[PDB]
Design an enzyme around this catalytic site. Structure first.
Site, short mmCIF file in Angstrom:
data_model
loop_
_atom_site.label_atom_id
_atom_site.label_comp_id
_atom_site.label_asym_id
_atom_site.label_seq_id
_atom_site.Cartn_x
_atom_site.Cartn_y
_atom_site.Cartn_z
N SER A 112 -5.18 -5.73 -32.14
CA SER A 112 -4.85 -6.85 -33.01
C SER A 112 -4.13 -7.97 -32.26
O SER A 112 -3.55 -8.86 -32.88
CB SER A 112 -3.97 -6.37 -34.17
N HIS A 119 -5.73 -14.35 -1.89
CA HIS A 119 -4.48 -14.49 -1.16
C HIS A 119 -3.48 -13.43 -1.60
O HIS A 119 -2.31 -13.49 -1.22
CB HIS A 119 -3.87 -15.87 -1.42
N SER A 161 -2.78 -6.35 -38.48
CA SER A 161 -2.61 -4.92 -38.36
C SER A 161 -3.59 -4.18 -39.26
O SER A 161 -3.49 -4.24 -40.49
CB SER A 161 -1.17 -4.52 -38.74
N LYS A 162 -4.54 -3.49 -38.64
CA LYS A 162 -5.54 -2.72 -39.36
C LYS A 162 -4.86 -1.75 -40.32
O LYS A 162 -5.13 -1.75 -41.52
CB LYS A 162 -6.42 -1.94 -38.38
N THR A 163 -3.95 -0.94 -39.78
CA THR A 163 -3.24 0.03 -40.60
C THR A 163 -2.08 -0.61 -41.33
O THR A 163 -1.68 -0.15 -42.38
CB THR A 163 -2.66 1.19 -39.75
N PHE A 164 -1.54 -1.69 -40.77
CA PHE A 164 -0.40 -2.38 -41.36
C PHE A 164 0.81 -1.44 -41.46
O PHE A 164 1.63 -1.56 -42.37
CB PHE A 164 -0.74 -2.94 -42.74
N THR A 165 0.90 -0.48 -40.53
CA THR A 165 2.03 0.45 -40.49
C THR A 165 2.58 0.56 -39.07
O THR A 165 3.62 1.17 -38.85
CB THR A 165 1.67 1.88 -40.96
N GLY A 202 -10.11 -1.28 -33.42
CA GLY A 202 -9.20 -2.34 -33.03
C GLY A 202 -9.63 -3.10 -31.78
O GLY A 202 -9.66 -4.33 -31.78
N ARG A 203 -9.99 -2.36 -30.74
CA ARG A 203 -10.42 -2.96 -29.48
C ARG A 203 -11.79 -3.64 -29.55
O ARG A 203 -12.31 -4.10 -28.54
CB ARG A 203 -10.40 -1.92 -28.35
N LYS A 243 3.89 8.45 -29.74
CA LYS A 243 4.45 7.94 -31.00
C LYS A 243 5.37 8.97 -31.64
O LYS A 243 6.42 8.62 -32.17
CB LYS A 243 3.33 7.58 -31.98
N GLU A 302 -9.29 2.41 -22.92
CA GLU A 302 -8.93 3.10 -24.15
C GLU A 302 -10.18 3.72 -24.77
O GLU A 302 -10.09 4.68 -25.53
CB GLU A 302 -8.27 2.14 -25.14
N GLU A 307 5.68 -1.62 -34.05
CA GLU A 307 5.91 -2.89 -33.37
C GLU A 307 5.61 -4.09 -34.25
O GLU A 307 6.44 -4.97 -34.44
CB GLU A 307 5.06 -3.00 -32.10
O1 LIG Z 1 -1.64 -2.48 -36.09
P1 LIG Z 1 -3.07 -2.02 -35.89
O2 LIG Z 1 -4.07 -3.11 -36.29
O3 LIG Z 1 -3.23 -0.74 -36.73
O4 LIG Z 1 -3.36 -1.71 -34.28
C1 LIG Z 1 -2.48 -0.72 -33.76
C2 LIG Z 1 -2.89 -0.52 -32.25
O5 LIG Z 1 -2.14 0.62 -31.92
C3 LIG Z 1 -4.41 -0.27 -32.13
O6 LIG Z 1 -5.11 -1.45 -32.58
C4 LIG Z 1 -4.87 0.05 -30.68
O7 LIG Z 1 -4.76 -1.16 -29.90
C5 LIG Z 1 -6.30 0.63 -30.62
O8 LIG Z 1 -6.48 1.53 -31.74
C6 LIG Z 1 -7.42 -0.42 -30.70
O9 LIG Z 1 -8.58 0.22 -30.64
O1 LIG Z 2 -0.16 -22.05 2.17
P1 LIG Z 2 0.60 -20.89 2.80
O2 LIG Z 2 2.11 -21.00 2.56
O3 LIG Z 2 0.24 -20.90 4.29
O4 LIG Z 2 0.15 -19.46 2.10
C1 LIG Z 2 -1.24 -19.23 2.23
C2 LIG Z 2 -1.54 -17.84 1.56
O5 LIG Z 2 -2.87 -17.65 1.97
C3 LIG Z 2 -0.60 -16.74 2.08
O6 LIG Z 2 0.76 -17.08 1.69
C4 LIG Z 2 -0.93 -15.33 1.54
O7 LIG Z 2 -0.55 -15.27 0.15
C5 LIG Z 2 -0.26 -14.19 2.36
O8 LIG Z 2 -0.40 -14.49 3.77
C6 LIG Z 2 1.23 -14.00 2.09
O9 LIG Z 2 1.66 -13.01 2.86
#
Ligand SMILES: O=P(O)(O)OC[C@@H](O)[C@@H](O)[C@H](O)[C@@H](O)CO
Ligand SMILES: O=P(O)(O)OC[C@@H](O)[C@@H](O)[C@H](O)[C@@H](O)CO
Lengths: 556, 556
Positions: free
Chosen positions: A159, A388, A209-213, A271-272, A518, A357, A216
């Site tokens: 969700s 990089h 929320s599918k379940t709304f329970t 959900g997903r 849970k 999942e 979070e």
């Molecule tokens: O609050 P909801 O809608 O019941 O979702 C609660 C989440 O735990 C749930 O969506 C979870 O991401 C998976 O089941 C999706 O497949």
């Molecule tokens: O533009 P800069 O500061 O030379 O960074 C260029 C980037 O390719 C470089 O930072 C890269 O993330 C790694 O080597 C860090 O260890």
């Protein structure tokens, strides 16, 4: 148990033990000018093209044949039909799996134990559009007659991720829409920092929320209501600033939201796989309903491609079987998703849930424990940045990592007369070329000698300059990242996941793996209260809890 | 390869093959009331406590002893001293490795090439503080006499991720400072959407680039300068809106930035370890210099703990060896970082680069090709969101995934009288307990029977409700996520990475794996211009390029 007993699987594995290490991408291209032509497919959706180039994969015509024979003997086709026909393939929960109905714009009947579901699907869609219309036109006023400027979606997991990822991806099509925010984590920081920058007058909350329970979500929702009420002091006004997306009416009403403002979806929407239903309201509100319908249309186009295309040229199937090859034969633990598009910065994370999942399972449909690998670990970051950060490990590490490189031919921001996009494209192309080609010891030696290196210094640095290469990738190029194309890409992977689940004979549509956590959390919450030591758990959990109670009021 | 020849390693390996699969966390805790005490480390920094509970790992006193013996036999302590003493341990580039010098608050001399580096390190810090005060106080004026309201950091990889992650993590300490933006991708979308929200009159751009020749950064820089001069007009105003963090004086001047506007660092400062140098200017500007020094102090504290503590109680060493155990003995490909804190939403991504780019190597310091695994694939998302996204796979998948769970006891936003944080803590604790404990068939059955399930429903569901558990985790709990603590935490992992590199005998401080991709990109760049098809590469590269040229003109 099923897969390992399958003769097509055994034949495939025996072949790998005998010739697996032989395969060398550089050698394959050097000896077959038609490799690209033979290992790629171009899809014309009438709303842009999609080129799936899987030629830089460790496969030969023979390998592809065995992989397709396997998909066939594992009943992929019959399984697909059962899903589209509304059969209860989600066995453990005895439910249908119909996210395809949510975007079935052909409106072909899909009956679930007695009736066609389309009428209800389109009824919710109409309700959504009518609502988006009132909100985006100013028709819908706040408790003081003001227009809605901000929309806050409160939900987690299925969700949350889908709507967030899509609104981010389609930001260019949000002109004339309210600002959308997403609150998901129970961590107070999330809701707190979001509400700090909002006027309760022009703010609209969407409790998804599918379940709304879900703890979070419900907790965040109640906190939002308190925050709102502290300003609008009057309970009766929550009906103007709080709508719900759920399958349960009782709880919604209980929260203080009238059923008229409840956009429902059904139990056969996982959900997903729910961003296509009422869960996508925030999407419609952000980019308008016309674009939302294009999103759904793109997915429907891919749904048709998957259902009517022969396995040999079926994108989802090809991606899935290639995945099976690396997972079950080469033993690769992960799958990298690398979109060279800043707007798709949450794309990998979306499928991290959608894929993991779904197929992060170990019990088959027959109730037997698998004796082979299932879902891989999905990860990745958008293109040009990754180069990089972690490509170093992909190029010269000790892990084989299949990578999917994606990019739109046309950019939403052709600044500097296209200079930036041209460079982006060059890197997109160059990286897969490098992973395939590599650089031999001899090639590296010549380079170093040309650099005037002494024999001592040349030898000390030489091996570090060698790129063994032979690292496989898929390049997915599309005309432009529009709502339609995005819809087609998401659905494409949805089916890739479906196909792999069928091959492994697992239930890609349940998620019993979340219950234990849970349960244990509910038993700990009350124990955290007070300063008395806890001794009811293992010494570790006991020790952590006591550390927390001790440091709870420590002054830094 | 040194590691495989080490006798302590072979002994460890032999033990694992003989007893490895016998280790069962639940059993270990059930039979050892002293487990938590024997496998946990509490650090009092005088500025908050950090508890490293590694008891939920598949280890015994005997295993930890073999691990420590290996760290010793691989010369970890001698290598550490060489790093701190300024010796050029970055062998392939013949450079010192001194990010530790950047935060050496003790100012004890560190000599490189006959000269103490601290004087230059502090000179830059003072220059940084002076500049910060001017900009923050409003003393620094734009070309129109207006103060600075927005600071835009333009850089990529090491010159991006660090300041981005830290500014996000320390938002609570940013009151007063100007808004900070981070542009990194070459993808025109990144700079286009940023510039759209700025006023050239009150915008200050920071060009972060060690070399100052990186294509993405220089191109973004030039685009910003053009955008700026579009309104300003005279090349003379640039000096008031652009500063540079680099080591390349000639190029900085060539760009249009005059010295004194250039905050330098040195070649012994690796990009992925450079947030502590001038590269951290955006952090200082955002949270003030006092907080920045707190960040440096936190790291210095950890540096001291790493240098003076016996291996057996050395946090980064223990973290490192536990990883070696899972990587080289259990064969685990990945390492999950799961911080239960929204502010740390980019923490995992930061170490994805810090770890993978450092240890994603396959050649030892002696030039031998490794015949064992090296750096793991690092990934993750903040908790509790992950619990609804991918934890399904961690709990019931077919992969062993070591997980690092992190969380601060005190929240920056104790809303609802701590209700949100109470729940967050409960989940943090419950998840590792669940991964360890699991739920047996009999436990599951009893629950199903109590739930009133029929025999046939109980029987089809039973298997799917079983959690085999025995999945290892590290719980890192700290009093509060302050600048100092964050600094200690980042440094802790930097040294973990250092220790593992030493054990594998690889050079964790070079990055030759990025060269091939860059050179191939320079070759393709001019080939994209024409409308004529390209045939100079492998058929795949050719095909992708030609598709792009065809679809470039496609109208949608
Ligand atoms: O609050 P909801 O809608 O019941 O979702 C609660 C989440 O735990 C749930 O969506 C979870 O991401 C998976 O089941 C999706 O497949
Ligand atoms: O533009 P800069 O500061 O030379 O960074 C260029 C980037 O390719 C470089 O930072 C890269 O993330 C790694 O080597 C860090 O260890």
């Amino acid at each position: 148990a099923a897969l390992t007993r399958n003769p097509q699987f055994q034949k495939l594995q025996q072949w790998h033990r005998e010739h697996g290490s032989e395969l060398n991408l550089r050698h394959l291209f050097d000896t077959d000018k038609e490799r690209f032509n033979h290992f790629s497919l171009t899809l014309n959706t009438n709303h842009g093209h999609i080129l799936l180039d899987y030629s830089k994969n460790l496969v030969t015509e023979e390998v592809m044949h065995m992989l397709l024979d396997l998909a066939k003997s594992r009943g992929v086709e019959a399984a697909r039909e059962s899903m589209f026909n509304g059969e209860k393939i989600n066995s453990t929960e005895d439910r249908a799996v119909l996210h395809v109905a949510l975007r079935n714009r052909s409106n072909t009947p899909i009956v679930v134990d007695g009736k066609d579901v389309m009428p209800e699907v389109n009824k919710v869609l109409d309700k959504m559009k009518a609502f988006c219309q009132r909100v985006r036109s100013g028709d819908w006023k706040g408790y003081t007659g003001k227009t809605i400027t901000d929309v806050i979606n409160i939900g987690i997991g299925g969700s949350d991720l889908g709507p967030l990822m899509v609104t981010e991806a389609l930001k260019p099509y949000s002109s004339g829409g309210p600002r959308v925010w997403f609150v998901s984590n129970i961590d107070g920081t999330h809701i707190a920092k979001t509400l700090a920058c909002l006027n309760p007058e022009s703010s609209l909350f969407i409790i998804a929320s599918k379940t709304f329970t879900t703890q979070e979500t419900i907790t965040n929702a109640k906190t939002a209501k308190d925050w709102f009420l502290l300003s609008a002091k009057d309970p009766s006004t929550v009906a103007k600033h709080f709508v719900a997306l759920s399958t349960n009416t009782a709880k919604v009403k209980e929260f203080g939201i009238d059923p008229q403002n409840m956009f429902e979806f059904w139990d056969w929407v996982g959900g997903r796989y729910s961003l296509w239903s009422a869960i996508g309201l925030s999407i419609a509100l952000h980019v308008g309903f016309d674009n939302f319908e294009q999103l759904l249309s793109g997915a429907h186009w891919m749904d048709q491609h998957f259902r009517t295309t022969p396995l040999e040229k079926n994108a989802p199937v090809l991606l899935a079987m290639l995945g099976i090859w690396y997972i079950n034969c080469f033993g690769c633990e992960t799958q990298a998703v690398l979109p060279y598009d800043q707007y798709l910065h949450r794309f990998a994370a979306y499928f991290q849930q959608g894929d993991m999942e779904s197929n992060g399972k170990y019990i088959t449909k027959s109730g037997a424990r698998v004796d082979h690998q299932t879902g891989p670990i999905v990860w990745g970051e958008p293109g040009t940045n990754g180069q990089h950060a972690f490509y170093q490990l992909i190029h010269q590490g000790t892990k084989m990592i299949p990578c999917d490189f994606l990019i739109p031919v046309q950019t939403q921001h052709p600044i500097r007369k296209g200079l930036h996009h041209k460079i982006l494209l060059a890197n997109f192309l160059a990286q897969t070329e490098a992973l395939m080609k590599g650089k031999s010891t001899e090639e590296a030696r010549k380079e170093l000698q040309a650099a005037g290196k002494s024999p001592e210094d040349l030898m000390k640095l030489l091996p570090h300059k060698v790129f063994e290469g032979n690292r496989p990738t898929n390049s997915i190029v599309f005309t432009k990242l529009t709502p339609f194309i995005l819809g087609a890409l998401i659905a494409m992977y949805e089916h890739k996941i479906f196909v792999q689940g069928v091959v492994w004979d697992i239930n890609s549509f349940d998620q019993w793996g979340v219950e234990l956590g849970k349960q244990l959390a509910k038993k700990i919450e009350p124990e955290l209260d007070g300063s008395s030591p806890v001794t009811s758990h293992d010494s570790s959990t006991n020790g952590l809890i006591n550390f927390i109670k001790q440091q709870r009021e420590a002054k830094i």
